[PDB]
Amino acid sequence: HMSLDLLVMTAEADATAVLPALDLLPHTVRVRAPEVTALLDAGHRDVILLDARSDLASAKSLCRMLKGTGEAATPIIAVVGEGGLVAVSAEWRTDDILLPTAGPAEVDARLRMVTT
Template sequence: MCMWFTEVRNLTAAEGVRSMRVIMFTHEGDVATVLPSASFLDSHVECRPPTPAFYSAIDDADVVMVDARGDLMRARALCQLLSGPMDCPPIILVMEEGGAAVVQPDWGASDFVMAGATPAELSARLRLLRARSLRGAARAAGRPQGRGLLR
């Protein structure tokens, strides 16, 4: 493994991504086929088919990824289902370049990442998404949250 990827792997472990549970809804059996940089995360990404029988897999997930590389309409419908009537953790769409032009807020996704993203970008997006999610949960529970060292 080249030195750059070794440093990224050590960085992600030091920054707390290791403890995340990530589910990816995809027809692929291996996350590396969809998002090669996910292979370098210290978190295991579980691939599940995007069918109703597997929607309960999100129950204890920290982040849900949706493979939107092929069928954008189905990806949109799945995002809307998961973020609407279901209690779903934050959703990240995995997209090809052209797909980003059509994503809208009504999809219900929290973020997106290009399929060719680097391990550092993917790790940063996961960390930021997790932090936003934790702040939102704390606000919902009525605990005050500071934005920095000074309030």
């Protein structure tokens, strides 16, 4: 699986504001709003990137929801500013975290590891 299908949950038009390095990787990126409704039928996804730069509480509870739905096993990486790093805990149930300034090598490493 060279390319992965990533769902970026964000109030933004594209992921380049959230994670710029994604633009330099071979993975295919689609964007949806950070709402349960938005996620109803995106289709396939290998990883969910959760945009958590601005509204940490929303992201936390959104994340808590997705993990514990009891059917969910899809990994979630939270993209956190420098910023809300102190706000990230095990309660989020994230599988990993990324700073928006992360370069391509680290983004790819973390996506691969969270799928393997």
